[PDB]
């Protein structure tokens, strides 16, 4: 009767930045979707390929809980077949993505009057990211053909930029904590079912 660490993911004190979104593998435990509903609407709760009602009696092999923080106007990019900053450079979801996306405002927790610069996103990249690929290297992005020599300058910019969340931000720019539950079904016993 070991409940899966969903409280560890959702009730984490500090979420991770989107460019290195915190991926946690959940397996060999009772999946407690029985309490993910009484927390009311968060701001968004969308299950692609499955239904929220039928999330109690279906077996999964591995549950990939991808927790990060983005802005409100940009969480719409957390969806299969979407284009944007997160999809191209930070977090890509495949067209055949079967899972759920939980987005809740966190202005109270992830905002500072002086500005919460601890959250970063990759604004520039040579090519778009493949699904479920993380790039953490902070090499200077080369825009032109001239060499950059690892120093910022003309056509040479640092890939990572700052959300800088503040409590007075609008709903579209407020710090929204997003957890993407990715469900995989392979030739495995799939020990994550839940009564």
């Amino acid at each position, epitope marked *: 009767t070991n409940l899966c660490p969903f409280d560890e993911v959702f009730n984490a004190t500090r979420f991770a930045s989107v460019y290195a979104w915190n991926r946690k593998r959940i397996s060999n435990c009772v999946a407690d979707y029985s309490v993910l*509903y009484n927390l009311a609407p968060f701001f968004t709760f969308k299950c692609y390929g499955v239904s*929220p*009602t039928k999330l109690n009696d279906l077996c999964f092999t591995n549950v990939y809980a991808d927790s990060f923080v983005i802005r409100g106007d940009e969480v719409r990019q957390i969806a299969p077949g979407q284009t944007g900053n997160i999809a191209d450079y930070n977090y890509k979801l495949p067209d055949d993505f079967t899972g759920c996306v939980i987005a809740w405002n966190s202005n109270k927790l992830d905002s500072k009057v002086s500005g919460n610069y601890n959250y970063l996103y990759r604004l520039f990249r040579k090519s778009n990211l493949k699904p479920f690929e993380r790039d953490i290297s902070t090499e200077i992005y080369q825009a032109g053909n001239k060499p950059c020599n690892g120093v910022a300058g003309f056509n040479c910019y640092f890939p990572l930029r700052s959300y800088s969340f503040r409590p007075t931000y609008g709903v579209g720019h407020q710090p929204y904590r997003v957890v993407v539950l990715s469900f995989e079904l392979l030739h495995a016993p799939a020990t994550v079912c839940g009564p």
Partner: antibody
Amino acid sequence: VQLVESGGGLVQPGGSLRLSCAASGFTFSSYDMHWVRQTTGKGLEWVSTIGTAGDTYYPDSVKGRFTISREDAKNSLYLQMNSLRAGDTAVYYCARGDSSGYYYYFDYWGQGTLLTVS
Amino acid sequence: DIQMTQSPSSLSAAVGDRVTITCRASQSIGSYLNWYQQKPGKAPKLLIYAASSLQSGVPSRFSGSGSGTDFTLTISSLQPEDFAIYYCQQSYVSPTYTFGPGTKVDIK
């Protein structure tokens, strides 16, 4: 198996109503009920969903306005509607949903009831 | 949200003919589609689920095919009672399910 709707009528704008659906021929504590409304032109439109473990889902334009509920002892489904606007005039149907694995579908609906606002 | 479209908007066919109606989603949705039939004065009734499977009790003359973005519903033989409005509904994105605009099949 049957579903019967009731509660339709003419109400003033900004009022409230309580629509009801009675289900028979199947266990009510195993199916997830839905409310789907239909208007001329705009076609069918999903309005509400309630599942087994006390969870309620509504669209963006409906969330915070309606309230779905169920009674397993009476095997009944209820829908509170408040702050009614001119766009709520529709034929409402109560739906039984079942999933053949990963694919979700509405098996059977009821007869529907017409709600109009003046 | 995923906007859903159907074609043709209006259609007329004779009894015993074979007809095909197409449905298109704003983005790839896989095989998560359902087909409903609504006769005038009656609530819509489920015909096809998962875009390729037959509901229990419906005649086999209804068939569904297609995956991704384009789907087709085919009636090999048309009956006089088939005059109705047909809806395609995507089950990929939940709980905000969306229905097609509805295609009208008449009798010639």
